[PDB]
């Protein structure tokens, strides 16, 4: 029966208004009743191996210049896969295993433009992402036993979550990649790059989790290029943060990311891209 007047802060993406003077509601309340993650569990992608039952086998293609399909010349057999961690992200595959010799591309149909072009790396391009705001986690009890973990006031300055990638290293790796595009699109052609066409946050931005929060990072900065070939600096990146996620077609759930108390910094390798192409 008794009620309170508690206060909390929310990110712009989570709320949406209805028009008193002004108001708001959570963007999930019209789609699905959500569940908060227990702040006890972790989301860390740990190396998981996939092993076969008895009387079964898994075949490992130990071929450097392997484009994924067809007869792999030298094959080995193994019971379990090497440690593959569930790093889930969009437009950027993170922390995986690089290619051995040359950046080799993989695609089902290079001719059919509607098929995504999975690109594997040979050097792990370094990415450092943070959110500088020192934050508050005020435990608002909405009883009984149920305990909402709200955000409280802000401690310190205000400046969004960003990502840093060395310009030079990326300006070199992009050349290394376009070098392998020309083996598909003619010995001498021009390969431009642009940002996403249009769609939801999960598609047009760098959806990923790091330390407990879900970044959606603009990808327009990196894709600035045009390829004509026959000191210290970084390319800073501007990310929005979300808590109420709807990940997956609509089958993850809607889940409230429990706010993290402190400064969240993570360093990651980028090991591949999920490209697309539009005579």
């Amino acid at each position, epitope marked *: 029966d008794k009620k309170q007047k508690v206060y909390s802060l929310f990110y712009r993406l989570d709320v949406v208004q209805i028009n008193s003077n002004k108001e708001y509601r959570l963007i999930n309340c019209n789609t699905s009743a959500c569940t908060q993650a227990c702040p006890k569990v972790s989301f860390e992608p740990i190396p998981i191996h996939y092993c076969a039952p008895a009387g079964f086998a898994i075949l490992k293609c130990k071929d450097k210049k392997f484009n994924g399909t067809g007869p792999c010349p030298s094959v080995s057999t193994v019971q379990c896969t090497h440690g593959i961690k569930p790093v889930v992200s969009t437009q950027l595959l993170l922390n995986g295993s690089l290619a051995e010799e040359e950046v080799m591309i993989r695609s089902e149909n290079i001719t059919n433009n509607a098929k995504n072009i999975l690109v594997q790396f040979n050097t792990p391009v370094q990415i450092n992402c943070t959110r*500088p705001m020192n934050m508050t986690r005020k435990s608002i009890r909405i009883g009984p036993g149920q305990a909402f973990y709200a955000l409280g006031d802000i*401690i*310190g*300055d*205000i*400046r*969004q979550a*960003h990502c840093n990638v060395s310009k030079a290293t990326w300006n070199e790796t992009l050349g290394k990649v376009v070098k392998q595009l020309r083996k598909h699109f003619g010995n001498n052609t021009i390969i431009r790059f642009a940002n996403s066409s249009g769609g939801d946050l999960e598609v047009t931005t760098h959806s990923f989790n790091c330390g407990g929060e879900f970044f959606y990072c603009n990808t327009s900065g990196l894709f600035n290029s045009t390829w004509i070939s026959n000191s210290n600096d970084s390319i*800073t990146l501007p990310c929005r943060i979300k808590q109420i996620i709807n990940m997956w077609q609509r089958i993850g759930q809607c889940m409230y990311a429990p706010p993290i108390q402190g400064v969240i910094r993570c360093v990651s390798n980028i090991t591949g891209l999920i490209l697309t192409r539009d005579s």
Partner: antibody, heavy 132, light 106 residues
Framework: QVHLQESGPGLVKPSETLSLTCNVS????????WSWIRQPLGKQPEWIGY???????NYNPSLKSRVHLSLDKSKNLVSLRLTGVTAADSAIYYC??????????????????????????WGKGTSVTVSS | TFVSVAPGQTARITCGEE??????VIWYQQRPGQAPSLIIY??????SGIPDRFSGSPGSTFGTTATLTITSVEAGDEADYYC????????????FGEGTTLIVLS
């Protein structure tokens, strides 16, 4: 060297145009940014506003509607106009050279930074009283 | 407000509301009957003519207040002290920080 010399009526009736001037020396009016600061008797100084050639000039929000600034390059003087004076406006009006600065708490990328000001060299001031 | 310090000791002076962001606070020493003289900017960067006695709080701290540290107080330092606060979180202040009178004793 450097020197400042305010001047003006030293008294104006209510609801009139107080006009004050600041004689400049030791440099040009085009070079430095200027600022004015009135100080009521026994109270804390209320900063008026800052003026520079090329239109870099902003005013106090508490008195934004009533104030006016200018610089006479030929005469080499810091002008000042204020309209509708009242009892709350009687004070010692100083004249101060002002210097800009940049405080950067971030990556600078944003626009995440702020211009803080500091008036290093002052003037003696002029006692502007207000009574009928 | 008045601060009474024994001679040759260290005085401290408190100015303004609590910090909200990383700040840049100016410190002014107005002597009785004279004009304010600029003492410290950048929260600890003193210009020409000011000894390294006077100190302050670096504007990197949040939640704490603006502090002025007068080391080895001398008779001349008897004055009123103001300060201009530049918080990254609060709008530009045009009302200078309220005074604090230093009183060397005996």
């Amino acid at each position: 060297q450097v020197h400042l010399q305010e001047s003006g009526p030293g008294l104006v009736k209510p609801s009139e145009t107080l006009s004050l001037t600041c004689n400049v020396s030791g440099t040009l009016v085009r070079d430095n940014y200027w600022s004015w600061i009135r100080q009521p008797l026994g109270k804390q100084p209320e900063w008026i506003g800052y003026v520079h050639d090329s239109g870099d000039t902003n005013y106090n929000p508490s008195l934004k509607s009533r104030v006016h600034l200018s610089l006479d390059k030929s005469k080499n003087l810091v002008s000042l106009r204020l309209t509708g004076v009242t009892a709350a406006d009687s004070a010692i009006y100083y004249c101060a050279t002002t210097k800009h600065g940049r405080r950067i708490y971030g990556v600078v990328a944003f626009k995440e930074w702020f211009t803080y000001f500091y008036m290093d060299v002052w003037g003696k001031g002029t006692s502007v009283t207000v009574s009928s | 407000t008045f601060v009474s310090v024994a001679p040759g000791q260290t005085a401290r002076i408190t100015c303004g509301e609590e910090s909200l962001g990383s700040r840049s606070v100016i410190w002014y020493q107005q002597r009785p009957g004279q004009a304010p003289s600029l003492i410290i900017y950048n929260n600890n960067d003193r210009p020409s003519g000011i000894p390294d006695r006077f100190s302050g709080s670096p504007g990197s701290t949040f939640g704490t207040t603006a502090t002025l540290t007068i080391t080895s107080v001398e008779a001349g330092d008897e004055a009123d002290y103001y300060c201009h606060i530049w918080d990254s979180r609060r709008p530009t202040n045009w009302v200078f920080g309220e005074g604090t009178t230093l009183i060397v004793l005996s």
